[PDB]
Amino acid sequence: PEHYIKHPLQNRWALWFFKNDKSKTWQANLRLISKFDTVEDFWALYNHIQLSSNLMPGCDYSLFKDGIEPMWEDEKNKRGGRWLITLNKQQRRSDLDRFWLETLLCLIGESFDDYSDDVCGAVVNVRAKGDKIAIWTTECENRDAVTHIGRVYKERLGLPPKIVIGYQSHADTATKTKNRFVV
């Protein structure tokens, strides 16, 4: 079977695209692109789509587990939060696409050991002020899951100890205690 079978992933994933258009509400600008659940179909989709550094400002990619929409209001996002990476304009050139790819692999490869089930998905926001990459988890009060996801994520990106990243609750973000956790 190793010669002809695709390699199934532990989860089915959905990639979303956001295009800012002020003619529409925020939710109406969010659209599902396609779904995949094997290694081969992931790479066929990835090689087909623009790199994040090539999207126009105001666009997002979101990769989330099937059945979870990339918004605060989803049942699996209400009580959760995000591990947030902030990139200056220089870092769009040097780190955005490679950090985003590593994030994608952390997701579909379930790199967070027993706490991968706490992972909902990830978002990259391309903006003129500064891009952002985030991993969304399902429970902001789950201290032991969040911290472990934070340490693995940080070392998988190669961020040095001189850098610190923060975890923010969506309830805090949606009301417009900033960082609950830092690693």
Curated annotation (Swiss-Prot):
Family: Belongs to the eukaryotic initiation factor 4E family.
Pfam families membership: IF4E (PF01652)
Region (EIF4EBP1/2/3 binding): 7-10, 43-47, 102-109
Modifications after synthesis and translation: Phosphorylation increases the ability of the protein to bind to mRNA caps and to form the eIF4F complex. Phosphorylation also enhances its mRNA transport function.
Effect upon mutating K132E: Abolishes binding to the 4ESE element in mRNAs
Coiled-coil stretches noted in the UniProt entry, renumbered to this chain: none
Localization per Swiss-Prot or TrEMBL: Cytoplasm, P-body; Cytoplasm; Cytoplasm, Stress granule; Nucleus
Name this protein carries in UniProt: Eukaryotic translation initiation factor 4E
Effect recorded for R127E: Abolishes binding to the 4ESE element in mRNAs
PANTHER family: EUKARYOTIC TRANSLATION INITIATION FACTOR 4E, EUKARYOTIC TRANSLATION INITIATION FACTOR 4E RELATED
